[PDB]
């Protein structure tokens, strides 16, 4: 009923929007939000790929994707808390002391 092209296009559009929100925004919290958007988009693409072939490997890859999303969200939020407690600002362009 549903073609694979529409679901993969939806997942691709979500990945594009997450990457755009990751690039264009200076806030680290919004950058982590965009990162979780791309993770959810890749997980959605895996779910559509698994549901097309009828195999259960897509849902297992979705489980691995959300486990990675959980642990990476925890790590990024701990780093965000440390950056707020030390620098007292969340501008990702402010912490750029490493020049070439």
């Amino acid at each position: 009923m549903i073609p694979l092209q529409h679901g993969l296009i939806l997942a691709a559009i979500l990945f594009v929007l997450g990457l755009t929100g990751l690039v264009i925004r200076r806030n680290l919290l919004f950058m982590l939000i965009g990162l979780e958007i791309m993770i959810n988009a890749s997980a959605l693409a895996f779910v559509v790929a698994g549901s097309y072939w009828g195999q259960t490997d897509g849902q297992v890859m979705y489980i691995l994707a959300i486990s990675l999303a959980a642990a990476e969200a925890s790590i990024g939020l701990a780093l965000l808390l440390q950056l707020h407690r030390r620098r007292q600002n969340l501008n990702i362009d402010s912490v750029s002391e490493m020049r070439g």
Binding site: V16, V23, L29, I33, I63, A71
Partner: protein, 175 residues
Amino acid sequence: MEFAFYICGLIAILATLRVITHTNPVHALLYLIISLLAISGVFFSLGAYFAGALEIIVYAGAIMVLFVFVVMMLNLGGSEIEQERQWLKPQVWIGPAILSAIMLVVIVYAILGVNDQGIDGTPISAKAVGITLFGPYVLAVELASMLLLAGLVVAFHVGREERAGEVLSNRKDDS
């Protein structure tokens, strides 16, 4: 279950579009919550009941919980960044958007050219995920437990308080 899939995808795209170009972050997190709900509805519409139930259980019931917990914890409203309004300036807005849109058009050109057998029925329940989760994919969940343990250790070691107090005003470099 096809029109439900299409409308859930459309409101998911709309919700994440309001996520990307928002100003205060708690409304953006709410829009991401309803976006995750819509992607869960997409998962339900494709026979992946476990995936959508997982998205609201884990991705919308724990991860957005962590995001709003941090936001509601350290009291950002986006202060000193809303008044700047850098993202609603065009000389920064054209560049990455048209670059990642070129990525969009090339990846959806790569999407086409594949044979269309359609999304079938036969919804894969949690029983099949269980029998293929502890059969061929045992080391996946064992080392995923190890990976989650590592992530817990990393984030606990990085982000603990080191100071006493359930109410703390912000000192530079932690006193």
